[PDB]
Write an enzyme that holds these catalytic residues in place. Structure first.
Site, PDB file in Angstrom:
ATOM      1  N   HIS B  41      73.230  29.944  21.907  1.00  0.00           N
ATOM      2  CA  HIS B  41      72.717  31.288  21.660  1.00  0.00           C
ATOM      3  C   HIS B  41      73.695  32.402  22.145  1.00  0.00           C
ATOM      4  CE1 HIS B  41      70.408  31.197  25.643  1.00  0.00           C
ATOM      5  NE2 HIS B  41      71.103  32.328  25.741  1.00  0.00           N
ATOM      6  N   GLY B 143      71.459  36.861  31.633  1.00  0.00           N
ATOM      7  CA  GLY B 143      72.807  36.570  32.097  1.00  0.00           C
ATOM      8  C   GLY B 143      72.911  35.234  32.823  1.00  0.00           C
ATOM      9  N   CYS B 145      71.779  32.322  31.668  1.00  0.00           N
ATOM     10  CA  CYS B 145      71.910  31.193  30.753  1.00  0.00           C
ATOM     11  C   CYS B 145      73.247  30.493  30.907  1.00  0.00           C
ATOM     12  CB  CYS B 145      71.612  31.587  29.314  1.00  0.00           C
ATOM     13  SG  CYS B 145      69.981  32.357  29.099  1.00  0.00           S
TER      14      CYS B 145
HETATM   15  C1  LIG Z   1      66.029  36.951  29.456  1.00  0.00           C
HETATM   16  C2  LIG Z   1      66.100  35.594  30.109  1.00  0.00           C
HETATM   17  C3  LIG Z   1      65.694  35.418  31.429  1.00  0.00           C
HETATM   18  C4  LIG Z   1      65.746  34.161  31.998  1.00  0.00           C
HETATM   19  N1  LIG Z   1      66.171  33.072  31.347  1.00  0.00           N
HETATM   20  C5  LIG Z   1      66.567  33.230  30.080  1.00  0.00           C
HETATM   21  C6  LIG Z   1      66.556  34.458  29.416  1.00  0.00           C
HETATM   22  N2  LIG Z   1      67.011  34.582  28.083  1.00  0.00           N
HETATM   23  C7  LIG Z   1      66.443  34.064  26.973  1.00  0.00           C
HETATM   24  O1  LIG Z   1      65.379  33.447  26.962  1.00  0.00           O
HETATM   25  C8  LIG Z   1      67.227  34.323  25.698  1.00  0.00           C
HETATM   26  N3  LIG Z   1      66.519  35.197  24.745  1.00  0.00           N
HETATM   27  C9  LIG Z   1      66.577  36.644  24.973  1.00  0.00           C
HETATM   28  S1  LIG Z   1      65.972  34.673  23.304  1.00  0.00           S
HETATM   29  O2  LIG Z   1      65.223  35.752  22.739  1.00  0.00           O
HETATM   30  O3  LIG Z   1      65.340  33.413  23.533  1.00  0.00           O
HETATM   31  C10 LIG Z   1      67.373  34.384  22.243  1.00  0.00           C
HETATM   32  C11 LIG Z   1      67.239  33.376  21.327  1.00  0.00           C
HETATM   33  C12 LIG Z   1      68.225  33.150  20.385  1.00  0.00           C
HETATM   34  C13 LIG Z   1      69.355  33.909  20.365  1.00  0.00           C
HETATM   35  C14 LIG Z   1      69.557  34.933  21.322  1.00  0.00           C
HETATM   36  C15 LIG Z   1      70.754  35.676  21.446  1.00  0.00           C
HETATM   37  C16 LIG Z   1      70.895  36.587  22.449  1.00  0.00           C
HETATM   38  C17 LIG Z   1      69.849  36.771  23.333  1.00  0.00           C
HETATM   39  N4  LIG Z   1      68.701  36.114  23.278  1.00  0.00           N
HETATM   40  C18 LIG Z   1      68.549  35.190  22.282  1.00  0.00           C
END
Ligand SMILES: Cc1ccncc1NC(=O)CN(C)S(=O)(=O)c1cccc2cccnc12
Ligand SMILES: Cc1ccncc1NC(=O)CN(C)S(=O)(=O)c1cccc2cccnc12
Lengths: 304, 304
Positions: B41, B143, B145
């Site tokens: 992602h 950030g 991930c």
């Molecule tokens: C915010 C957070 C806090 C703790 N741990 C993980 C996170 N991020 C997420 O869960 C990621 N997301 C914001 S999401 O919507 O699942 C996503 C899916 C697919 C492509 C993407 C591209 C860029 C950003 N998001 C994407």
């Protein structure tokens, strides 16, 4: 989201751990620059643990009696001295992995990470707090002495604790890196009972702020209190008195959540008087007090 | 004595963390040999999070679009491929700090350490368990991930988790290092509700053994039970069924303490039916399930 009991990354401290042996006793040492710091009780036999005269015991020791091993290589000891309850073993080689460091003496309520070690080898890392009775509730077995407590500010490691002993109640006592024990404890096997282990009120409030930031809001109530009213309840429950300094320190958390510190105090007051009623806050059924307001901001903001 | 939620020393993993940027998105990567592993992602914009077609999105990306930074030095990307939900970025330089490593896929109930990172920089380390519903209760912000979960066996790091996402309930989902999610989760922002988060029965029993070893014995009773009787109570309380494999795995703890596994099950049964009555076990007011029988033996024996 999520809130965990988090320790600092331990790599910078792993690069400092060495094994120190004097006679039959082996414990851990901390190698910074060309000095290895370790508990002075490394010179004692278990037979003389009741009333050791460290100065006299040290007279029978020479540089070659302190065996210092960093990994599988031996360090040459070129000097030794006692500073309070620690030995400083001067070696001929500066630790090439010495990080930027400071020796600090923390106050009760302050948290730190411990790198538990055996034979100079790291076994695990956990987060602790210096209790108001100057003990720590650690996880230490025989051979763990010399394991250190520390905090990291970007790339500077502030060493605050060195493990020395376990009291008969299973709680731990140790020194700062100048060899001064926290609290009234001594490196002798004698009657050393800890005082009241009160709850670190300011830390509980910081943790209640973390809970609100992470979605756990059920405990928030329609009440407020004063510092004096709150403190009457806090004394009753063996909680540390809350001061205006603590209120000020919680200012950034109050500002981020929009919940006045005294309103959070009233929520805490009701939690003390009514209990949890089988509910949990941040996966805990008791009020957690080993997160400082600084730890809450750090974890909730992602400081690296 | 003392029993703490302990993570593995994180140094070996800190030496592997890098920053990966693709366009405007920055997350963490794991650099082992000449390969950098990261969530796929990283190629998406938040605007296309609802229904990303990773294969199509990847066609518009070239090696030079993946910016990999290890500390303050840039790594040259000479290849890129997608394996399930991870990207493998081949770099021209093998990580000189690559430890001995394995990629393992863990089972629910298994614990591991997480090195939470931001911008390729470690912020903290905590201990987790893979929940029976294949989520983890971590501490992760935007950030984080690409932060990884791991276990260490002396000098070999077994990587088991890579952080990918947060579900709307504040729980976390991720993959093994082959890019396969644990559980039914997908790297899309969609309705993904977790199943029942049951309690890891075998881990609670291991933790009750740790409590006995460390002096907390008040919960020990005069009763025993059978696996079938215990499991009727366990189902009622959303506890995982206990199997003969779990009983066998608790054999060394049973042997060290002299408390038969089924007797400890009866103690646990009474704790479930009667509650804690305001008492604590190892400083906890709830039954802890994020210590495996292996973690208990390791911590109680001082494995380094
Ligand atoms: C915010 C957070 C806090 C703790 N741990 C993980 C996170 N991020 C997420 O869960 C990621 N997301 C914001 S999401 O919507 O699942 C996503 C899916 C697919 C492509 C993407 C591209 C860029 C950003 N998001 C994407
Ligand atoms: C066992 C343990 C577990 C966890 N954490 C610390 C420990 N060790 C201790 O408490 C150390 N003791 C056994 S002691 O009796 O306090 C002691 C005092 C003075 C000199 C000594 C020399 C050699 C060994 N002990 C000495």
């Amino acid at each position: 989201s999520g809130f965990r009991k988090m320790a600092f990354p331990s790599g910078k401290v792993e690069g400092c751990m060495v094994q120190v042996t004097c006679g039959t006793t082996t414990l851990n040492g901390l190698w910074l620059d060309d000095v290895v710091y370790c508990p002075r009780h490394v010179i004692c036999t278990s037979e003389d643990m009741l009333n050791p005269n460290y100065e006299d015991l040290l007279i029978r020791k020479s540089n070659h009696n302190f065996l210092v091993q960093a990994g599988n290589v031996q360090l040459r000891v070129i000097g030794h001295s006692m500073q309070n309850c620690v030995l400083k073993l001067k070696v001929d080689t500066a630790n090439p992995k010495t990080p930027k460091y400071k020796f600090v003496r923390i106050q009760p309520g302050q948290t730190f990470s411990v790198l538990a070690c055996y034979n100079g080898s790291p076994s695990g890392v956990y987060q602790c707090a210096m209790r108001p009775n100057f003990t720590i509730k650690g996880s230490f077995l025989n051979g763990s002495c010399g394991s250190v407590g520390f905090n990291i500010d970007y790339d500077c490691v502030s060493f605050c604790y060195m493990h020395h002993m376990e009291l008969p109640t299973g709680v731990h006592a140790g020194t700062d890196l100048e060899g001064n024990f926290y609290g009234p404890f001594v490196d002798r096997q004698t009657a050393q009972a800890a005082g009241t282990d009160t709850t670190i009120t300011v830390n509980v409030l910081a943790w209640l702020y973390a809970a609100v930031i992470n979605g756990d809001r059920w405990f928030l109530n329609r009440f407020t209190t004063t510092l004096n009213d709150f403190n009457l309840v806090a004394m009753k429950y063996n909680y540390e008195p809350l001061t205006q300094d603590h209120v000020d320190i919680l200012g950034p958390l109050s500002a981020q959540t929009g919940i006045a510190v005294l309103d959070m105090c009233a929520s805490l007051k009701e939690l003390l008087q009514n209990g949890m009623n089988g509910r949990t806050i941040l996966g805990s059924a008791l009020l957690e007090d080993e997160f400082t307001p600084f730890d809450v901001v750090r974890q909730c903001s992602g400081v690296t």
